[PDB]
Amino acid sequence: APPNILKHVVGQFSKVLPHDSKARRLFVTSGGLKKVQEIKAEPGSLLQEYINSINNCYPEEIVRYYSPGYSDTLLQRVDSYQPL
Amino acid sequence: APPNILKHVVGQFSKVLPHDSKARRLFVTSGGLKKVQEIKAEPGSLLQEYINSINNCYPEEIVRYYSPGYSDTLLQRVDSYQPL
Known part of the structure; x- marks a missing residue:
């Protein structure tokens, strides 16, 4: 779906996922939240809050x-790291 | 070059690199050490010690x-990292 349609899908997921554990497990095992993270949002548009709510349904580590x-951040940390 | 020829090149690098820093810098910046890492070696063959000597010329984290x-190791370290 184009970026102007994904907002409704992300909102519906952020409305359905918090009230279903099996839905969240299926979403994680299918790799959909990775795609959600790969979707940009305006810092203040409803899509941003929908994405943040999507992330709030899972631990920060996941x-x-x-x-x-x-x-890439980890690799640059290794580049800047020096051993003792 | 085939693996039965790479032993001589790795040995030459392991005998040249410890005695020059500019060569080590050009080898790192050219990304040759990553290729040296993807070379397999028998656990006991001279290629193994040549590769180990190659690693000893550089920081362990490089x-x-x-x-x-x-x-993936960095990612799994982060997945167990809890921000303070």
Whole structure:
């Protein structure tokens, strides 16, 4: 779906997922929240709050695991790291 | 080059690299050490000690940086990391 349609889908997921554990398990095992993280949102548009609510349904470790571009942060941390 | 020829090159690097820093810098910046890491070696063959000597010329974390699957190691370290 185009970016202007994904807002309704993300809102519906953020409205249905908090009241269903099996739905969240199926969403995680299918790799959908990774795609949600790969969807941008305006800092203040309803899509941003929908995405934040989506992330609030899972522990921060899982969200960071499915967060794009974090591995590059780890690799640059290793580049800047120096051993003793 | 085939694996039965890479032993000589790895040995030459392991005897040249410890005695020059500019060569080590060019090898790191050219990304040759990552390729040296993806070379297998028998646990006891001269190629194994040549590779180990190659790693000893560099910081352990730089060697890890170019080691295969290291991004996954960083990711699993983060998945157990709890922010303060």
